[PDB]
Ligand SMILES: N[C@@H](CCC(=O)O)C(=O)O
């Protein structure tokens with residue numbers, strides 16, 4: 378009856394509300410995905426419960442164990458009915474879960490501490506002074522692991538063998554490493570998160586160069602779910618009405634601190 382929604386604490390998508398300890402259920406959270414969940418639910422005609430993914434991950438299949446972790450895993454093993462998060466539509470995921478058409482368009486980009494002598498991915502690859510990494514488990518990490526393009530293969534080769542590790546557990550961890558490294562650490566993350574951080578105090582980071590690829594985030598459901606068709610139509614209806622753009626403006630730029 379009540380649709381269990383799996384999501385992830387990733388700003389500005391889902392964040393803990395100021396006085397959440399005094400609130401209950403869905404009212405404990407706020408963010409772009411919280412506003413979107415409320416809308417997809419209204420339009421699809423269902424009651425839901427927001428749940429933060431237990432392992433705090435997006436979703437990857439473990440090569441040795443074959444188990445799916447993160448939000449994807451919660452959908453695959455039936456722990457959740459739908460995932461409303463900045464979850465990238467990829468081929469390996471679409472083979473096990475269903476995705477609506479994209480609700481947000483993005484691409485991998487570079488986050489530097491202001492003043493870092495880096496203008497592109499080619500620049501990162503051609504040097505060693507400045508370290509660079511990605512989110513440990515996710516679509517960005519896989520983009521480099523599977524890239525046939527020379528510049529990205531070179532970047533991956535360095536990243537996988539770099540010590541100490543250049544990969545981080547969460548986006549926030551990557552952002553702090555950038556901020557605390559005096560320009561000695563650049564971070565590869567999706568343009569959406571980069572643009573969000575670029576508008577947050579201490580206003581010391583910046584997105585550089587173009588996007589490395591083009592892709593989208595989709596609302597995910599288990600393969601052959603009943604909700605699939607309706608949520609896809611809701612995403613299309615809401616994009617066409619201007620809500621998705623309105624929501625990105627609200628959480629990224631309207632509340633900008635820089
Ligand atoms: N949106 C990504 C996580 C962030 C990243 O990989 O940079 C995913 O669904 O895996």
Ligand SMILES: [Zn+2]
Nearest residue numbers: 416419420615
């Ligand atoms: Zn509406």
